[PDB]
Amino acid sequence: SHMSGGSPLATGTTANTRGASQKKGGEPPALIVDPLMKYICHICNRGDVEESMLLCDGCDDSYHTFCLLPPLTSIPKGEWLCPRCVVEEVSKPQ
Numbered sequence: 040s041h042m043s044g045g046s047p048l049a050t051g052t053t054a055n056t057r058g059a060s061q062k063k064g065g066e067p068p069a070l071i072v073d074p075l076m077k078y079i080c081h082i083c084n085r086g087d088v089e090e091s092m093l094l095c096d097g098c099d100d101s102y103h104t105f106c107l108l109p110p111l112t113s114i115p116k117g118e119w120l121c122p123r124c125v126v127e128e129v130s131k132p133q
């Protein structure tokens with residue numbers, strides 16, 4: 040059996056991708072701006088307007104009116120419930 044025709048597929052290509060790997064080329068180690076306690080709107084990571092910052096009566100966390108979609112056209116005259124808790128029934132998971 041002499042089936043040695045001899046046909047190599049010698050076809051190269053310059054496959055080069057320089058993956059620039061600067062882990063902190065624009066990422067500084069941020070220090071704790073709120074070391075003790077400060078009611079910050081965790082949706083916007085900032086306590087922008089404290090006068091528009093609500094605290095869920097049936098939870099505990101700081102939200103802005105602005106940070107919710109759509110922004111709360113009326114400021115809650117009574118204690119504000121988070122939309123999570125607003126969808127309740129007699130049977131809680133307790």
Ligand SMILES: [Zn+2]
Nearest residue numbers: 080083103106
């Ligand atoms: Zn906010």
Ligand SMILES: [Zn+2]
Nearest residue numbers: 097098121124
């Ligand atoms: Zn709640």
